[PDB]
């Protein structure tokens with residue numbers, strides 16, 4: 001056996017997994033990533049305007065109190081270069097890179113039932129054995145594309161936001177962006193003032209609220225650092241872990257004037273989860289409440305965008321649901337003389353040619369640069385790109401052919417000694433706290449197994465199915481089921497997130513570890 005544990009991924013999840021298993025459990029560990037450096041999604045996504053949804057002081061690890069006191073809190077939210085710099089400092093400080101093998105994709109992982117360990121094979125045909133396999137593959141996968149006809153004929157710059165190259169310049173160029181979601185809102189806002197002309201190809205108009213990303217004073221920062229213990233206690237006692245005052249107030253239980261005041265206060269403070277969950281307690285649950293949130297944003301759109309026909313084209317016709325978006329000046333962009341909005345739901349893209357995007361009306365939109373601002377695949381995307389075989393050689397893709405599943409978001413029946421970080425049916429909450437929660441639970445179970453000579457840990461089918469039912473029962477009280485959210489698993493009816501909150505999740509998994517790991521088979 002080469003290692004006690006093998007870790008796939010060197011983002012937030014894989015890095016803390018390595019720290020806990022190597023330095024706290026004193027195990028022999030190796031992590032692998034295709035990336036050339038740590039950071040995960042913050043290494044891969046380097047597009048213009050990439051920015052956290054979580055406020056800076058909470059989008060980080062909490063377990064190293066020296067790091068908390070040391071860390072840079074430059075603005076209220078944190079840019080992609082600065083998240084990457086942070087994670088590199090973590091790897092510096094805890095000497096992680098010597099046990100990470102970079103530029104190394106994992107092709108397959110086959111469980112050896114005779115030896116109760118995993119046979120792991122890299123894409124360069126290196127074989128490694130390890131008792132435990134930690135799959136820290138992240139909650140999102142890159143989504144490829146149904147090829148637009150003729151895309152291969154385009155002779156200008158063709159950039160995908162999931163593989164954004166260095167050295168891109170914008171001045172003097174006609175630029176187009178396909179995609180107006182999470183990523184597209186950030187890219188469009190960042191580049192509109194830099195290009196000669198911007199054409200935005202909008203397939204679905206989405207809601208977005210201001211992010212309110214401001215510089216943090218030394219005073220601001222000192223008071224956060226003085227109160228950090230209480231700040232994290234509030235995280236662990238919350239549903240979402242975003243530092244919000246999570247509301248229980250029903251939207252329709254106050255007057256129209258008081259409702260507008262509450263929305264306006266959130267709009268001015270900024271933040272997508274703030275607008276959706278600090279204002280009232282039923283926006284994601286009650287359609288009448290949700291329409292109030294919709295209308296507030298639609299009214300802001302009509303006030304910001306002066307041309308009422310442009311404002312109409314930007315105005316959504318859907319539920320205010322899915323992961324809430326925020327922006328640094330998105331609707332304002334459409335007042336610019338050098339910006340054109342194309343509704344490609346009404347006027348679809350039908351072809352790309354050597355110098356243009358062609359819409360169904362026959363119009364050739366001439367471009368020097370075309371940007372595909374893509375969405376993301378759900379969690380199981382990264383898993384079916386690895387040939388993972390468990391008991392009886394059944395693959396993870398086959399085991400999940402009828403929909404992904406898990407016990408607690410961390411274990412899959414028929415896949416012993418494998419632990420997922422951010423696997424299917426993990427809570428919806430701020431990611432670093434979820435990740436620390438899961439990594440610490442896995443390490444407690446693994447350290448337990450080492451102390452009790454147990455060498456095969458497996459969730460039962462009944463435990464997996466009960467968790468699917470638990471998640472289904474919560475998720476179907478909400479509008480997220482009805483809203484068809486790609487990042488929650490609508491393209492895999494079902495929402496593959498535990499939506500009972502971080503505090504309740506930590507109660508659920510602590511009950512399991514406290515009751516002799518019920519739902520798990522512990523074998524010697």
Ligand SMILES: Cc1cc2nc3c(=O)[nH]c(=O)nc-3n(C[C@H](O)[C@H](O)[C@H](O)COP(=O)(O)OP(=O)(O)OC[C@H]3O[C@@H](n4cnc5c(N)ncnc54)[C@H](O)[C@@H]3O)c2cc1C
Nearest residue numbers: 009011012013033034040041052053054105106137138431
């Ligand atoms: C632009 C953007 C902004 C975000 N902002 C927020 C935010 O504000 N708040 C929040 O809570 N979440 C946010 N997220 C969600 C984000 O996924 C998490 O916060 C967190 O970064 C996930 O870390 P991870 O280590 O779990 O996964 P990742 O960072 O995705 O790391 C997974 C790693 O696994 C590697 N890997 C996968 N398959 C293989 C293989 N076969 N072989 C080798 N390596 C492999 C990948 O290369 C990747 O580096 C954001 C995501 C994006 C894309």
